């Protein structure tokens, strides 16, 4: 029946992986409180007229390169690669996350979206243009989000579903 899309949210500590997921799942953002675990969350959404189910893994915990961890990530059909626009190191780590995705999926062509989060903040250190140019050289979409104001959140996840759909055809 209803198509399920397995999405994986990856990126450095503190960029807003959990805050983005919770906005989508529970429509809220509390400045003071944040998830502390890795977990996956299911939500039925309508995207371009298609009722579907998103199964979203919000990654956390420890970096680890075991066969078990690799195989878990390999079930992801699409990946949000998140950095924070006020955190240059988190932007510099994006190439590494992409490379691990391509390694476990064993493919040059994995549905992926680059997400620049915390667009509400004024202390910007990553120009929008530099992130656009990076996404263009990878050949993937780039979306600026604010998990605090919810700006661009649906766009990020829905765009990733659209990349998965193109891949399955
Ligand atoms: C904030 C929570 C936290 O402490 N985490 C640990 C680290 C930050 N996580 C994480 N880190 C990296 O790289 C970190 C770093 C710095 C030390 C050396 N190392 C390499 C670069 F220098 C950057 N990489 C992560 C991942 F690659 C992945 C991951 C993503 C996709 C994928 F297919 C696979 S397969 C596989 N095994 C791993 C791993 N590990 C990945 C992940 C993720 F959680 F699995 F997605 C985390 C990485 C983030 C969090 C957990
Ligand atoms: N202003 C602002 N703050 C944000 C935004 N998204 C997340 N934050 C803040 O940034 C911090 C980290 O958020 P969180 O969602 O825990 O990030 P994470 O990537 O899941 N961290 P971890 O990797 O440790 O699980 C929190 O204080 C959160 O309130 C955003 O769009 N705007
Ligand atoms: Mg988190």
- State the alpha helices, DSSP H only, in the chain: 17-26, 67-74, 88-92, 94-105, 128-138, 153-167
Alpha carbons 115 and 153: distance in angstroms, whole number: 9
132: exposed, middle or buried (Cβ count in 10 Å: 0-12, 13-18, 19+)? middle
Q: Cβ(143)–Cβ(113) under 8 Å?
A: yes
User: What residues flank ligand 2, with Cβ below 6 Å?
Assistant: 13-19, 31, 34, 60, 117-118, 120-121, 146-148
Nearest to 82 by CA among 133, 16, 139: 16
Main-chain phi, psi angles of 51, to 5 degrees: -65, 125
Residues belonging to the chain: 169
Alpha carbons 146 and 153: distance in angstroms, whole number: 7
Alpha carbons 116 and 151: distance in angstroms, whole number: 11
- 37 DSSP 8-state letter: S
Would the CB of 104 count as within 6 Å of ligand 1? yes
Ligand 1 centroid–CA 13 distance in Å is 9
- Which residue, by CA, sits nearest to atom 37 of ligand 1? 65
Nearest to 132 by CA among 91, 100, 96: 91
Task: List the domains of the chain with CATH numbers.
Answer: 4-165 (3.40.50.300)
Q: Experimentally, how was this structure solved?
A: X-ray
Entry resolution in angstroms? 2.1
- Which residue, by CA, sits nearest to atom 12 of ligand 2? 14
Q: Which ligand 2 atom sits nearest the alpha carbon of residue 60?
A: 25
The first and second tokens of residue 151, run together, are: 């700006």
Number of Cβ within 10 Å of residue 74's Cβ equals: 13
> Is the C-alpha dihedral spanning 22, 154, 45, 105 positive or negative?
negative
Alpha carbons 97 and 63: distance in angstroms, whole number: 11
Nearest to 92 by CA among 151, 59, 134: 134
């Amino acid at each position: 029946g209803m198509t399920e899309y397995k999405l994986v949210v990856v990126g450095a500590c503190g960029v807003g992986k959990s805050a983005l997921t919770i906005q989508l799942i529970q429509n809220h953002f509390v400045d003071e409180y944040d998830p502390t675990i890795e977990d996956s969350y299911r939500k039925q959404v309508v995207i371009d007229g298609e009722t579907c189910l998103l199964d979203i893994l919000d990654t956390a915990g420890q970096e680890e390169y075991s066969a078990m961890r690799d195989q878990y990530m390999r079930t992801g059909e699409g990946f949000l690669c998140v950095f924070a626009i006020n955190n240059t190191k988190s932007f510099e780590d994006i190439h590494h996350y992409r490379e691990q995705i391509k390694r476990v999926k064993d493919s040059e062509d994995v549905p992926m979206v680059l997400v620049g989060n915390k667009s509400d903040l004024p202390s910007r250190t990553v120009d929008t243009k530099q992130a656009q140019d990076l996404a263009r050289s990878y050949g993937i979409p780039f979306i600026e989000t604010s998990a605090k104001t919810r700006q661009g959140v649906d766009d990020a996840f829905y765009t990733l579903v659209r990349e998965i759909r193109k891949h399955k055809e």
